[PDB]
């Protein structure tokens, strides 16, 4: 019975010991806190001492929620063993990092006005902790550590972690958002590792999936990780957070949900939460519905270590333990560093206005550096002369940054050959030995061989011809989104599944090998994404940043769901180049079109992307033909320019028999930003008979062309704007001049009056081309608060009303 | 040996769910792949009996997850109810469950046969969600609760309408949007004498976005019923029943954000009952590509919610877990998650052969008999029903299938906002009417005193004007709900709606004193002010839902900076701006978006006026950027008293809060009304001559003060500055009447701080020359140049650009 009380007691400490650990350096919560010499083979006093030291000191360990027994066993074996005391050299090294952090903070708060919001005072221990992460990654012989973080302590991280000189850091608010790169050299090791920091907006947590994509991109380049020869995942994501942001931002859960996915895994992220137990003026009880700000990470069974920021030794030990766990199980580790925010939220803030108790406690708190220096003499680890030299190291570090900053102040063809089209065509039939194709998929493969040799190439095959030819030319092609392998409209079939074994076959991957048998250097990476927009779009944006030579495409189920990724569109994709000098070549594929499927299956919001656009930020397009889409993708991947491309892609037009292209359009043409009717360019049509000109974009062209053909209207011409942004001013002016007898011009669109290209075109076209578009009138749906009507019947009436008005 | 028993007990309680027979498809083969049994162990029970209890409780058709819960009493409550030998259900209860499976399959057969293009909405393989939901609602009625509000995606929605909400087929199939509309009904107990209201909220196609909307809605109903957090009783008598899909629950961030609200004082609803229809597929995507955890529900561990994984082919276990979930919610006022393991009989889209992408799963599904047929056959095998009883169950199925076919066949064969001085003075005095022994922080004491001074002597600033508007509404009996990030104090240390005791930390809400009339009687009003969690998506969704749940409430959500509201885009796009036109669902929610170019960067400058103006259509939203405190006071009072349910978008100030020119007089609150268009006081009250004006500057917001200062400095009598206070709907008549008073105007300019592709110019530059061609033909723009970001990252560039605007305007 007494031996059973010991077993229950062991479980109690392992399971719930963290609830009694002395982790809070402020001690704000008061309520928080025989057979002893008999052997059970160790004495009961020694088993309890091991359990109190492991689970109830300055580290709160949460690991019994992990479903993997080997992971639980790994943690308790390393957590319960009696650890060797750190060497005086390691203790002095930790202290020097705390001297540099505090010196940098004192300088930053004294020299400049308006920097209290960015202060790391009360949280300087994050610097020796981050240093231990990076030194441990270098010890494992890893290649790079990429950091993502908020503004708090950023300039401190650049100096004391990234190793950027003060002349670069204080040269000429944007410094808090820019990316950086450096080299970390081991102090007591002979290894080095690249350390980089990614750019981010003020939007807390939005960079989380961006970092993951950047890291995965770098991993695939180094041939490490998921799409690599080795399982080292030699590029480590180090992600910093705030306690209020980590608990309340949905992107955190979405990014955690990507951690073990074949398309998004980076072999585990090291998470550091700077838990200062405050969110601006908000208390944790108003910021989260759980004990810990880190409880979201339990979602993927990640071990969590709550650690007292006033103990830099435990902080550095947990950092190294986190790296080793990540290396052993290729899974996320979360370090909850409990600490405090010495200063207020904004400038001129008296934080005792909203938190009087916390700030009366903080006013009695001596610094982490002073506390650690005093604890070293108390423990007899350092002498008085050594403590004096440490104070002189702090003073010299304080003088150095003041002195250095003082000195700084005083101072292309996209056409492919027939053989290329035929090769991609044949690849759809070059099935592995014994592969069983599903009977409904077999005619698609055969039709693609027929299309490649005989023409009448549809949208779905043209996309694969564009990507296939890029892979054949040595390019890495990454394509992903919801159900992207098959296609939402059962049109892609980039991955085909064996009817009998379930084995996947990727026909385009055969073009990664030249006809002679040698590799091209190209690769096709095609994945079904998780049911996320924010994290998935963020990941793909980050991927194009991490590998600028990659063709990176993200596909929306319907364009209507990309508003769930608005923060990435607004904060990264559309503005990152102008704000940070950070470039991305990410493609967003947005299925768009009025077909009567409702307000959430109709629009990718063209008007919003056109509004976000400014000269040289993005390319926005709605191609009407498969070949033009093929040339758009090939130009985007080969132009040597890093700029996002936004494409409004079809749904019903995928299977429209008029929306097919000839071999000559792929082999002897280029992307055409403005398209005329084939009857004028190739046929016997007379442009001089035209008195009414209809300017349009997308699938409605086919309907307008069908009505023109039906009524035999020689007086009407339909001109297509294929590239919406930048406006193809030169081509649009020279095209329209070919119709001299035009007396009226109309912009025709399916979208309501306040949506589509009209709100920007109606204003821009008469300004950019006043001799051509003065008196431009609109034919569209009436302005609506939704992208369309909920009724198929209303849709059909409205669609006919547009065609009747155009030919009225 | 006794220690091996204790470790074994923990193993079953902690990990037993990994070996439970929960998957009705049995897709994972590897899942399932000494003498001491008769010896008694310490209560003293035999090892064989300890293990039989464990296997039955943790390894049968219910996988229980609860040892992650930090509360020992909650862990004790679950194991005491799960580890006891349960009474076998009565033949009447078993027949009742079967009639609910009969009802559900008849509806599915009818819907798939009668109409084309309904396979994507099919519940076939998941029919057991109906007897499960029925058991939730019957259990809530058993507790004597007032309402169950459901939020769900499209799968099984019409079925839910018919057999849960109880809507007649004539209403469900009328002129066959029905998959998105709200509904309300009454549930009457079969074997009880209670009744309960059952409602279903409207929702977009955007999976999981309705999740915080439901919470808001339910909280509002709870506050009306004086139950829960803001009530006399802790019954939380309005239960949220939230339905989900396995792929959407694991991948949508809003799920975590809505779970994070579960125990917050400003957002708690007393626990939600979550039902996940886990058909182990997401369109064509396998769970291993949809999530990084063993279960789709693993996000719910974040708040320490018990999780029950249950085999959907066992409707008895499904109904038992539903009632256990309601009892847990009632006992601990926390979330319960039911992971109903099932399958998707048909494909994703119409004409989909799901064996194309999932051949194995669908070869298994092709051998699966229905949940109804499986339950009828198991009851025969268990001797619970006779052959005649099974035949009568087949007759009941045929009868319900005929009934819906027959009923659908028959269906086919057919204002002043001005307050008195005393009202301003009362709100002013309330800031000094401190509780006995309350200690005011020294920096907060002059704010309270200035508000008493402002109320009596004038020079009223923006922050006090807002509190005067909300204070007077509370005094008139209105419920006022105000929230957002650091909203109690205000991001710009300007509000102080809640003041904190310097010595005890106790909160004091001065405006709450206005809920009591001077005689001592209640007004019926209340001030509910909260600091939100660091969420935009969930918080905006919550406030939208709150205004839907209580249309007579003044509901305001405040952004830290307007620049962060894009994190709530799905709510703006799918509910606020479009809910009325799409579902006939109305909301009077106010969004306060701090906006203005001050050099604080591209994430501290714009609430994106151009995006809200683009979303706008006649009668959907009111969009405003007031320039004076009194005009903001009248905007809020008109919004709350106009008797119209329409969202209001307000672009609020940052530096203009403390601008001494941006102050108002008592008479502006006492003898005025909201002005959509504002002229310069020199023309309305001064000795200015409107006839001297040849150049007219049309503008909105804080830049007015800079333009007015430049005019006063250069003594420019030839320039007038007209303000558009209400951006949407355009104040066409007031704008036309005002411009008509300046007859010698030869040039007109729209002046704005925002880049040319942003602000009000993209819509105004197009609309104004069309709506008023005699006034705005030849309208020119003065603004920042078009940008890919809301502004520059440099304060220096900002300052040069701002001066360039003022120099151009007076050049
Ligand atoms: C997405 C987003 N929402 C709101 C803000 C505004 N904001 C800036 S600091 C802050 C509180 C930060 O809390 P926390 O995460 O605990 O970090 P800390 O400042 O304490 O290090 C907020 C809400 C923001 N920058 N981003
Ligand atoms: C937010 C959002 N993103 C994408 C979609 C498109 N979509 C429709 S159904 C589906 C897969 C649904 O998976 P699941 O949650 O498991 O539900 P199920 O259809 O299996 O019941 C998706 C991605 C959507 N409706 N909402
Ligand atoms: Ca490019
Ligand atoms: Ca109203
Ligand atoms: Mg914090
Ligand atoms: Mg599913």
Tab-separated table of C-alpha atoms in Angstrom, chain A residues 341-506:
chain	number	residue	atom	x	y	z
A	341	UNK	CA	7.478	44.319	-19.033
A	342	UNK	CA	9.539	46.872	-17.010
A	343	UNK	CA	8.127	49.906	-18.975
A	344	UNK	CA	4.581	50.697	-20.187
A	345	UNK	CA	2.772	49.932	-23.443
A	346	UNK	CA	2.833	53.299	-25.321
A	347	UNK	CA	5.138	56.319	-24.687
A	348	UNK	CA	4.170	58.330	-21.631
A	349	UNK	CA	2.177	55.373	-20.214
A	350	UNK	CA	1.928	54.907	-16.444
A	351	UNK	CA	1.163	51.138	-16.381
A	352	UNK	CA	0.007	51.313	-12.729
A	353	UNK	CA	-3.188	53.096	-14.120
A	354	UNK	CA	-4.630	49.733	-15.307
A	355	UNK	CA	-2.219	47.288	-13.457
A	356	UNK	CA	-1.269	48.926	-10.059
A	357	UNK	CA	-0.405	45.599	-8.299
A	358	UNK	CA	1.853	44.166	-11.058
A	359	UNK	CA	3.752	47.478	-11.408
A	360	UNK	CA	4.209	47.945	-7.626
A	361	UNK	CA	5.866	44.457	-7.690
A	362	UNK	CA	7.933	45.383	-10.870
A	363	UNK	CA	9.137	48.649	-9.117
A	364	UNK	CA	10.862	46.408	-6.452
A	365	UNK	CA	12.431	44.120	-9.108
A	366	UNK	CA	16.160	44.461	-9.708
A	367	UNK	CA	17.415	43.618	-13.216
A	368	UNK	CA	17.929	40.012	-14.513
A	369	UNK	CA	21.707	40.794	-15.000
A	370	UNK	CA	22.099	42.246	-11.429
A	371	UNK	CA	20.063	39.300	-10.026
A	372	UNK	CA	22.251	36.735	-11.884
A	373	UNK	CA	25.547	38.526	-10.847
A	374	UNK	CA	24.389	38.560	-7.166
A	375	UNK	CA	23.259	34.855	-7.410
A	376	UNK	CA	26.758	33.841	-8.712
A	377	UNK	CA	28.561	35.345	-5.672
A	378	UNK	CA	25.911	33.834	-3.332
A	379	UNK	CA	26.601	30.401	-4.905
A	380	UNK	CA	30.401	31.076	-4.794
A	381	UNK	CA	30.559	30.492	-8.583
A	382	UNK	CA	32.263	33.902	-9.201
A	383	UNK	CA	34.638	35.986	-7.002
A	384	UNK	CA	34.220	39.731	-6.151
A	385	UNK	CA	36.937	40.621	-8.755
A	386	UNK	CA	35.042	38.507	-11.369
A	387	UNK	CA	31.757	40.332	-10.469
A	388	UNK	CA	33.662	43.707	-10.769
A	389	UNK	CA	35.031	42.666	-14.230
A	390	UNK	CA	31.426	41.679	-15.223
A	391	UNK	CA	30.243	45.221	-14.158
A	392	UNK	CA	33.170	46.669	-16.181
A	393	UNK	CA	32.137	44.446	-19.164
A	394	UNK	CA	28.579	45.953	-18.866
A	395	UNK	CA	30.028	49.538	-18.669
A	396	UNK	CA	32.373	48.929	-21.651
A	397	UNK	CA	29.422	47.440	-23.619
A	398	UNK	CA	27.351	50.538	-22.666
A	399	UNK	CA	30.179	52.895	-23.742
A	400	UNK	CA	30.903	50.967	-27.005
A	401	UNK	CA	27.388	51.328	-28.472
A	402	UNK	CA	27.263	55.084	-27.375
A	403	UNK	CA	30.715	55.655	-29.041
A	404	UNK	CA	30.034	53.664	-32.289
A	405	UNK	CA	26.615	55.426	-32.836
A	406	UNK	CA	28.331	58.839	-32.089
A	407	UNK	CA	30.919	58.098	-34.867
A	408	UNK	CA	28.083	56.921	-37.216
A	409	UNK	CA	26.107	60.235	-36.697
A	410	UNK	CA	29.321	62.303	-37.340
A	411	UNK	CA	29.932	60.401	-40.645
A	412	UNK	CA	11.745	37.115	-73.341
A	413	UNK	CA	10.189	34.249	-75.417
A	414	UNK	CA	7.721	31.804	-73.828
A	415	UNK	CA	6.892	29.697	-76.928
A	416	UNK	CA	7.953	25.989	-76.738
A	417	UNK	CA	8.484	23.478	-79.580
A	418	UNK	CA	5.865	20.790	-80.678
A	419	UNK	CA	8.155	18.078	-79.164
A	420	UNK	CA	7.875	19.768	-75.703
A	421	UNK	CA	4.016	19.684	-75.915
A	422	UNK	CA	4.170	16.062	-77.180
A	423	UNK	CA	6.574	15.031	-74.357
A	424	UNK	CA	4.176	16.428	-71.632
A	425	UNK	CA	1.307	14.724	-73.533
A	426	UNK	CA	3.080	11.344	-73.684
A	427	UNK	CA	4.031	11.611	-69.944
A	428	UNK	CA	0.294	11.237	-69.047
A	429	UNK	CA	0.408	7.728	-70.630
A	430	UNK	CA	3.932	6.779	-69.404
A	431	UNK	CA	2.452	4.910	-66.430
A	432	UNK	CA	4.617	2.918	-63.964
A	433	UNK	CA	4.686	-0.877	-64.529
A	434	UNK	CA	1.572	-2.463	-63.011
A	435	UNK	CA	-0.161	0.890	-62.274
A	436	UNK	CA	-4.000	0.726	-62.400
A	437	UNK	CA	-5.674	3.953	-63.590
A	438	UNK	CA	-9.229	4.609	-62.404
A	439	UNK	CA	-11.594	4.116	-65.436
A	440	UNK	CA	-12.857	7.751	-65.298
A	441	UNK	CA	-9.263	9.184	-65.220
A	442	UNK	CA	-7.964	7.067	-68.207
A	443	UNK	CA	-9.861	9.201	-70.918
A	444	UNK	CA	-8.304	12.443	-69.464
A	445	UNK	CA	-4.749	11.011	-69.890
A	446	UNK	CA	-5.576	9.897	-73.481
A	447	UNK	CA	-7.256	13.245	-74.397
A	448	UNK	CA	-4.040	15.041	-73.203
A	449	UNK	CA	-1.943	12.883	-75.609
A	450	UNK	CA	-4.507	13.767	-78.375
A	451	UNK	CA	-4.491	17.534	-77.421
A	452	UNK	CA	-0.615	17.640	-77.422
A	453	UNK	CA	-0.467	16.205	-80.995
A	454	UNK	CA	-3.785	17.351	-82.582
A	455	UNK	CA	-4.667	20.614	-80.729
A	456	UNK	CA	-7.981	21.844	-79.175
A	457	UNK	CA	-5.963	22.206	-75.891
A	458	UNK	CA	-8.208	23.080	-72.915
A	459	UNK	CA	-7.369	25.304	-69.852
A	460	UNK	CA	-6.388	22.412	-67.511
A	461	UNK	CA	-3.892	20.877	-69.979
A	462	UNK	CA	-2.401	24.372	-70.934
A	463	UNK	CA	-1.618	24.976	-67.197
A	464	UNK	CA	0.189	21.571	-66.999
A	465	UNK	CA	1.975	22.330	-70.339
A	466	UNK	CA	3.255	25.643	-68.820
A	467	UNK	CA	4.399	23.973	-65.549
A	468	UNK	CA	5.701	20.849	-67.371
A	469	UNK	CA	7.868	22.919	-69.751
A	470	UNK	CA	9.243	24.978	-66.778
A	471	UNK	CA	10.248	21.694	-64.960
A	472	UNK	CA	11.830	20.505	-68.288
A	473	UNK	CA	13.875	23.784	-68.341
A	474	UNK	CA	15.155	23.014	-64.769
A	475	UNK	CA	12.691	25.054	-62.676
A	476	UNK	CA	11.261	23.969	-59.280
A	477	UNK	CA	7.462	24.127	-59.493
A	478	UNK	CA	5.476	24.187	-56.207
A	479	UNK	CA	1.687	23.991	-56.657
A	480	UNK	CA	-0.744	23.641	-53.707
A	481	UNK	CA	-4.187	24.540	-52.355
A	482	UNK	CA	-7.416	22.792	-51.324
A	483	UNK	CA	-7.875	19.576	-53.390
A	484	UNK	CA	-5.316	20.936	-55.906
A	485	UNK	CA	-3.928	17.456	-56.896
A	486	UNK	CA	-7.212	16.470	-58.635
A	487	UNK	CA	-8.674	19.925	-58.971
A	488	UNK	CA	-11.896	21.238	-57.326
A	489	UNK	CA	-13.548	21.019	-60.810
A	490	UNK	CA	-12.067	17.466	-61.422
A	491	UNK	CA	-9.914	19.030	-64.186
A	492	UNK	CA	-6.221	18.983	-63.042
A	493	UNK	CA	-5.227	15.332	-62.201
A	494	UNK	CA	-1.606	16.506	-61.375
A	495	UNK	CA	-1.502	13.395	-59.138
A	496	UNK	CA	-3.338	10.214	-60.199
A	497	UNK	CA	-4.211	7.488	-57.662
A	498	UNK	CA	-3.822	3.705	-58.251
A	499	UNK	CA	-7.343	2.051	-58.275
A	500	UNK	CA	-5.965	-1.144	-56.545
A	501	UNK	CA	-3.040	0.065	-54.295
A	502	UNK	CA	-3.714	3.754	-53.620
A	503	UNK	CA	-0.182	4.662	-54.865
A	504	UNK	CA	0.168	8.214	-56.273
A	505	UNK	CA	1.664	8.886	-59.797
A	506	UNK	CA	2.694	12.430	-60.883
